Amino acid sequence: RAYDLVVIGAGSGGLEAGWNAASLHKKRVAVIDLQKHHGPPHYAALGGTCVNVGCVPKKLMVTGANYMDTIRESAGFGWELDRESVRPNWKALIAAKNKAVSGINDSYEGMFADTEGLTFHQGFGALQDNHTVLVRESADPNSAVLETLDTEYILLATGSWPQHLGIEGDDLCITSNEAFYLDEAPKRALCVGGGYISIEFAGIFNAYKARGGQVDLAYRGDMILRGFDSELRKQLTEQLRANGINVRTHENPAKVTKNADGTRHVVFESGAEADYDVVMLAIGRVPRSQTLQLEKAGVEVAKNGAIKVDAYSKTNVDNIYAIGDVTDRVMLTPVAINEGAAFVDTVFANKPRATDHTKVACAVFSIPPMGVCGYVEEDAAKKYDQVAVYESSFTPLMHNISGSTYKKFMVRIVTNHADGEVLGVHMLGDSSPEIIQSVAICLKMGAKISDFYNTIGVHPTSAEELCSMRTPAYFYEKGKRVEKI
Amino acid sequence: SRAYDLVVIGAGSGGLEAGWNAASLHKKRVAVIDLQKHHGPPHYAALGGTCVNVGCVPKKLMVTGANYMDTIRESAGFGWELDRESVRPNWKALIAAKNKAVSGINDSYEGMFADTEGLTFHQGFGALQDNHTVLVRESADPNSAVLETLDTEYILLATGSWPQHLGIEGDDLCITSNEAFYLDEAPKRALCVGGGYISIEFAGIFNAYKARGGQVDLAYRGDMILRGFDSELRKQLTEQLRANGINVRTHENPAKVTKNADGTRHVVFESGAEADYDVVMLAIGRVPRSQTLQLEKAGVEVAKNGAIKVDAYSKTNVDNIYAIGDVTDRVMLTPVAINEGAAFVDTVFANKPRATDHTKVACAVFSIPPMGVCGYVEEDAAKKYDQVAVYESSFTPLMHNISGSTYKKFMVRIVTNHADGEVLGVHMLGDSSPEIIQSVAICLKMGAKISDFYNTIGVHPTSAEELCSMRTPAYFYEKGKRVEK
Ligand SMILES: Cc1cc2nc3c(=O)[nH]c(=O)nc-3n(C[C@H](O)[C@H](O)[C@H](O)COP(=O)(O)OP(=O)(O)OC[C@H]3O[C@@H](n4cnc5c(N)ncnc54)[C@H](O)[C@@H]3O)c2cc1C
């Protein structure tokens, strides 16, 4: 066939797989994407969501947002400055972010050029059969077919897309995509959604808002950050509120309308109403398989669009594999990359490999941030008869001094009480995204709580708290909480 | 029988741990002795130890304060506009804040003793009458008033260390870390003598709080500052201190110091160089504080430097006399002294002999930028194994290209035994490295191999993910000889 492989989606996983195949294995690969540079109209582009309108830019923006606290907190450590003079400049933030992302975009032309057998093809990928991939002008299956690629293997890696509401006024809302290109910071912003993207953006808006502004975060549920440790969800909620964010639970917009001055009027399902400069929907990310014509090749997909796969990322059609967000397993970049590498090993190096999706460390770049890995106690309790929960918190000394007395650092460890094995480690507070990476190496090695407490702490750090937790706070006996076992 | 089961001379990190453990957990009658309760002049260290009073605790708070110079500066690239001329350090407020924090810890001991039956605090200078009697005198003077005579079963010598002085003309004109903690004003011109960690840490503190137009020099008689640490990280740290305004003077050593008419110190280096500073701080070493204990009265053996000789179980050549902590000149860190204290109690009073494991102990350098390290540096590893692999990676975070602090390179170096992949040492430089290194220490204790590091999925974006992305050695040492293959 003309190509050994055709990857639809040149993102985290797809670009990793393609380059590995062509580069480390001399296969002829075609990778397809919609654009070569970041931003509208497609947003994601060559490099993926993470490079363009994901992890990379949002982290830069959260870093920029962190200075609001830094300028305030320096006062207790004897830093004098005119604080009344402080004015964040959103345009300058967006400009620096743009220049940094464009630089990564620029980096690819050389990548391809230097890799024989690796080619980039622009347009909308779709399937004609299990060996033929079409590159079309648009998502419409009726649009012009620009290229027809004949290939042995197919790798579907189209990622995900923002989920919308469909209420009246949905078109007056934005999503993370457009948030990355706003002309100016909203004075009043509504972040809809309880997930990490929503919370991360509420923090960014909270810092860059015009003095006197307000950021509201609305979640239809009981508590934000569904899926994360219950106590950290509760504690983070308090710290966001302490910093000015109005966290509104059991809250959902019913309809949005455009005011005369261009602001947005929101009528909530509760009957509550409010005006905002910006209403951002961060309610979920949908597997992007809807226009690939999978049935043309008979590929099985879940009701939500997720492409079904086995441990080695093989769909029901043996020569078609799918990796990354489109598979709706763990939606994080390093996992997509890992899967992309495993697939190449399996298919072109005769080394079958299944990505291990358990004990995957992830971070929540909220202000203040979280670093977590493994099971929350509730999940552990369902899988093990005896589970122990260790918890430790404290307000670092530096925060009493800074005045941010609400900044408690919290560490919670979940173990299988039968053998002491650590099933999950959940942290809240500054530096937790960095600490959790090394904690993940310990969990991968099957550390027991004793491996933690027998290690000599590094002092003074927040991380040494991991090594001083020896007695459980409570337990779960066959799924039920008990104060003792 | 004896009046006391145990008398601890020095109620610091290790001593207070051992005392409290024995009385609380073993119902032993324990007398702990220290020079004072309140931190500061005249004795500096106090009940709580050097770490709480004039060490780790206030040092870290001062380093955090110093970091704001850079962070407030770095905010501009992210769009933070403020009157840059108005930014100025206020040393006295830093000191006051730190004093208040340390005092609050001093005050906590009151309840600690009140709530611990059989645990008593005795204030004064402890000394040996014989192996079963400890005197508490008025001063270090062997001829001062005897306040108390303590008859006891066991004696634990935990008196810590003390700053080493130069003994050159003008030594009396210099200060040490002790006084540095109470300076009335930040020196506009300062000289930090020594290449060890305390000197480097103070250089960064002084560099931030100095009045504009000020200067900090760091003189070290040797080739490269931080003897004992990874050589590449040492080089890199030196350049980053230079890039932040610090003149690092290797092969420099004051020969004479005199007091100028305006009260400033005039230093004449051995080199022939001469200069004036407002403060000259010597941080060249810390000597075992055993000289006024009258150890000869019990026949306790000491080394030429005053270090009390001990076995793995911390026992001196006198069976009922133990010694822990800095006074033993083993690993001069708080957590280690604490560990030794707990092991001591288990051995003597819980009849569960435990020898502290002084290997694979992680530690940090709170310089600006910081370091987090653990295990063997490659030079020592090359000496004990026949095939050593060195892995290295450095990158300059994108955020620093935006902040303007372009010199802020992050570095990770891993030393392994190439024959089996065992990770012998991990050395990191850059922000959060003290936080990251803590869990690295847990896995090295667990016998981690390099594959454990690289099979762990990364957390993105973080600097720590670099630890899990290294799989090819940079070079090797074949039987001590460095080679590329
Ligand atoms: C705001 C935000 C913040 C995030 N923050 C983090 C974080 O901090 N850390 C983290 O690990 N993860 C984070 N993520 C998730 C991370 O971006 C994704 O998990 C990862 O990018 C998914 O990788 P992928 O290979 O599955 O797909 P992607 O990287 O998304 O790549 C898919 C590519 O396919 C292209 N494409 C789609 N359809 C077609 C088609 N029909 N034809 C051709 N090309 C097509 C798209 O243009 C896209 O470039 C974040 C996501 C968002 C949106």
Ligand SMILES: Cc1cc2nc3c(=O)[nH]c(=O)nc-3n(C[C@H](O)[C@H](O)[C@H](O)COP(=O)(O)OP(=O)(O)OC[C@H]3O[C@@H](n4cnc5c(N)ncnc54)[C@H](O)[C@@H]3O)c2cc1C
């Ligand atoms: C500036 C500085 C920064 C440091 N930073 C760090 C760091 O970041 N991390 C780290 O782990 N370590 C650090 N250290 C080292 C740490 O402070 C020590 O390793 C630790 O305190 C040693 O514990 P110890 O029990 O041996 O003695 P100490 O904690 O020093 O306690 C000894 C006590 O004995 C008392 N004493 C002395 N002689 C007598 C006597 N004759 N009678 C009665 N009482 C007496 C003293 O008052 C003192 O309180 C630092 C040290 C300094 C000076």
